[PDB]
Design a protein around this nucleic acid. Structure first.
Ligand SMILES: [Mg+2]
Ligand SMILES: [Mg+2]
Ligand SMILES: [Mg+2]
Ligand SMILES: [Mg+2]
Length: 49
RNA sequence: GAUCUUCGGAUCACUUUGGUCAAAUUGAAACGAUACAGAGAAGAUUAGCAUGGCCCCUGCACAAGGAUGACACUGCGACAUUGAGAGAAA
């Protein structure tokens, strides 16, 4: 337990240090990812037609 | 027509029309239904003020609210070289 719990906090800390984007960065990129993914299906409909 | 007065002749009164349709689908609000997604500040929860306009609603308002109303970028570069080595073209 004690060896295991030390290794958990050591991995959680590597996440904190790694990313600074915040809520607005993550939600703004998903909007890009949805719009881009939406087109690829929409453009295939144009070639299909 | 009326009043004077020769049956002539006077005199009074003078050009309307507020129209985005000439008869409610195809010429002046959009919202609503549905589907998805589902709320700032570098752990998580959290008050806010501003900031900039081809974004705007509520409001008599130069009060105040509306998520802090919402939305918001950050490669370039006015190009020097040094010294050496290799390559193709004069
Ligand atoms: Mg306000
Ligand atoms: Mg808030
Ligand atoms: Mg409020
Ligand atoms: Mg504001």
């Amino acid at each position: 337990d004690m060896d295991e719990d030390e290794k958990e906090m050591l991995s959680e800390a590597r996440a904190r240090l790694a990313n600074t984007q915040g809520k607005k960065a993550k939600r703004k990129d998903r909007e890009k990812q949805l719009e881009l993914t939406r087109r690829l299906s929409h453009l295939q409909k144009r070639r299909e037609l």
